[PDB]
Design a binder for this molecule. Structure first.
Ligand code: HEM
Ligand code: HEM
Ligand SMILES: CCN(CCc1cccc(F)c1)Cc1cccc(NC(=N)c2cccs2)c1
Ligand SMILES: CCN(CCc1cccc(F)c1)Cc1cccc(NC(=N)c2cccs2)c1
Ligand SMILES: C[C@H](O)[C@H](O)[C@H]1CNc2nc(N)[nH]c(=O)c2N1
Ligand SMILES: C[C@H](O)[C@H](O)[C@H]1CNc2nc(N)[nH]c(=O)c2N1
Ligand SMILES: [Cl-]
Ligand SMILES: [Cl-]
Lengths: 362, 362
């Protein structure tokens, strides 16, 4: 059943990919090559072209992603050659540097060897390559609660955080054949961070908020023609609401709205004053302002939705079915001010795609 | 098949209703009565208790409604006795007066005779009993575009609007046996309207915005134990976002955000300034402030979501399955600031319930 699922996914992916690449005549012979390679080895190896286009298709098919207009410009780095933990570390460090690009963020994915027997070659423990630690002691919370369990697992491995609200977690990953992951502190020269200030309200800096420049998701599986690349970190740039309306605002995250209300000079006493809404808007204005001022890429939710509308128009004109998850595509502030809120989307799963996988800790 | 659908719905409703009313022992004999009444007449007549509880259950089962905590206090007015158009008019006028209650809004439903052969006895054309007209001429828009087609149909019947942005549509409805609906101008003494002012920004009144106090939906079918009450207008009070974030804000409605930005003193030039978001928050603050100042009931979306959380807790403790439509329950501003955004809901249809029906015009 395994070779069979693999062969079926392979046939479908190659046909579609080669059709998109104008290589339809090559499908028959490539599929023959593949079928015998599966017969003899139990798997097959993608060409560089397939791997690159596969990763781009996978982004294009990500139902929850508002940023998909730019799917065809994904920078794909092929690291299927790595064998050692130093090589993995250096490839992750490199991804950070080249994706960051001095603030002008380049959407990039680095692809490591794929699972074999469902056996991982490289197992990345981080949720994102750059993220902040979280702690709970004396019922007192420090840092990012979403990082609590991974932070605890790193401290089990001999790492120790400074317990600021913004400790950078080390890279942490396990190699096939090793019982424990290794961890490596991030060089600070590689990590751009943005202090959050407000364009008009000077007191806003009293909150001492900041966030990191580049979100690099490192715990999803890329699936392409039946091959499972469980280790394939990827980044875009942030949409400002992700930081201003969720990471810094959620009660179960940094929970800053009451403090925001206070520095912007409004009472946080009555639901009918809409103080949370007002605090949310000023915090989100500050986030966009701060990234722009530092020369770090970011997009506001209005511009992002306009780009997404173009993606829809592009799909239609290319004759491709559009799929989407309305509940994730609407931004968490003023969603009815975007066109997204007012239409519906088919939430069917199309492959290639990025998928959740079980955490190796907790 | 018709008597069969009716009998099946009847059995289910009576059992459930009598169980809730502590009258389980009466179900067997009531169902016998019903079965022969259906045999002999093709239908059956609800007792006053069934009709009242049926309407309350229908509200409780409305997946899209955030205001359901208060389902058991619905005021049910039984007007199954009406036979004449004057009687219908006077019952609609009465509903407006008693629901409005001098500003302290009472959730009320008036129930007219139900369909017989699928033949309507009373056919109400209005979407709400109180709503504003809409016009399009010279490509120039006046009033509420959502009312354009009904406005055109009323003007076909000899009504003429003044073409202000807030013309009250007449009541318009058709009686069984009549080829055309009749229309009746609303007495202005019955209609509370609220001028929109802002608690801090004096210039806000320059926009000359207002809205009506009481939303009274008059075009949905109430279905209870297989009986189709196509004419059964009902009201609650407004949640402020319905007015401030949609009716007055949508581009296809009153489209006021640019004007709002202007009177609150912000530029409406750059997406990254989040001027639409900021305008939305100030407009919504003004709406809540204005209703409160006039002594007309209204609820903000934070309080409404807290009430809805109680409805969920109440369902669970009563052992009732909860159903809901996440896409409609989230408010259109700051939805991630409510608990609703962060959980999921079963969108199954349970009866009794309120349903859309085809418009008799257009
Ligand atoms: C270029 C700028 C990009 C922007 C502005 C953007 C925007 C977003 C946003 C706002 C989300 C929702 C995240 C959340 O609420 O937690 C998202 C989800 C997602 N994006 Fe994108 N994205 C971009 C690029 C990319 C790239 C390069 C990929 C992969 C190649 C990608 C794949 C995804 C996936 C898989 C999700 C869903 C994550 C999940 O289900 O948890 N995106 N995107
Ligand atoms: C008491 C105060 C109430 C509040 C604050 C409230 C709130 C709301 C809101 C905000 C909506 C969404 C409307 C839209 O976006 O167009 C809604 C939908 C709805 N409500 Fe309520 N509601 C209340 C009372 C009632 C009552 C008394 C009934 C009937 C007995 C009712 C039945 C419904 C139904 C059927 C819908 C869905 C309409 C549709 O699908 O188009 N509600 N409610
Ligand atoms: C933690 C919140 N987001 C994912 C939600 C999640 C993740 C892991 C486990 C969960 F249960 C839920 C993170 C995320 C995912 C995808 C995109 C983004 N935002 C971005 N702009 C990008 C990150 C990488 C490419 S684009 C954030
Ligand atoms: C026109 C927008 N709303 C319904 C959407 C709709 C209506 C008719 C046809 C459509 F295609 C779509 C109106 C509505 C419906 C239900 C409740 C409310 N708001 C209220 N607070 C109440 C009105 C009546 C009881 S509560 C508004
Ligand atoms: C239950 C609900 O679907 C869930 O909490 C979602 C809602 N939509 C979302 N949308 C985005 N973009 N990100 C999120 O974390 C969530 N949370
Ligand atoms: C397509 C989408 O589901 C639709 O436009 C909805 C979204 N959620 C909504 N929710 C409410 N309460 N009211 C609405 O009119 C809408 N519009
Ligand atoms: Cl994030
Ligand atoms: Cl309305």
């Amino acid at each position: 059943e395994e070779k069979e699922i693999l062969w079926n996914e392979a046939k479908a992916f190659i046909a579609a990919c080669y059709q998109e690449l104008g290589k339809a005549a090559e499908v028959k012979d490539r599929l023959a090559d593949i079928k015998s390679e599966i017969d003899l080895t139990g798997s097959y190896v993608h060409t560089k072209e397939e791997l690159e286009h596969g990763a781009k298709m996978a982004w294009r098919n990500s139902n929850r992603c508002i940023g998909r207009l730019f799917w065809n410009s994904l920078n794909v780095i092929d690291r299927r050659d790595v064998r050692t933990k130093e090589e993995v570390r250096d490839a992750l460090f490199h991804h950070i540097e080249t994706a960051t690009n001095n603030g002008k963020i380049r959407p990039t994915i680095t692809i490591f060897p794929p699972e074999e027997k469902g056996e991982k070659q490289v197992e990345i423990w981080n949720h994102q390559l750059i993220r902040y630690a979280g702690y709970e002691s004396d019922g007192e919370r420090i840092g990012d609660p979403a990082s609590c369990s991974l932070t605890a697992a790193c401290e089990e491995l001999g790492w120790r955080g400074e317990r600021t609200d913004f400790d950078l977690l080390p890279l942490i990953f396990r190699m096939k054949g090793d019982e424990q992951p290794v961890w490596y502190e991030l060089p600070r020269s590689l990590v751009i961070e943005v202090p959050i200030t407000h364009p008009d309200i000077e007191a806003f800096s009293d909150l001492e908020l900041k966030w990191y420049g580049v979100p690099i998701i490192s715990d999803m599986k890329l699936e392409v023609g039946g091959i499972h690349y469980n280790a394939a970190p990827f980044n875009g740039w942030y949409m400002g609401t992700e930081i201003g309306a969720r990471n810094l605002a959620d009660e179960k995250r940094y929970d800053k709205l009451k403090k925001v209300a206070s520095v912007i000079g409004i009472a946080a006493d009555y639901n009918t004053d809409l103080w949370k809404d007002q605090a949310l808007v000023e915090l989100n204005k500050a986030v966009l302002h701060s990234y722009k001022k530092q020369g770090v890429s970011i997009v506001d939710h209005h511009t992002a939705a306009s780009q997404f509308k173009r993606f829809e128009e592009q799909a239609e004109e290319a004759g491709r079915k559009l799929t989407g998850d309305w509940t994730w595509l609407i931004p968490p502030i003023s969603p009815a001010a975007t066109h997204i809120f007012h239409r519906s989307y088919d939430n069917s799963i199309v492959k290639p795609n990025y998928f959740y996988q079980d955490k190796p800790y907790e």
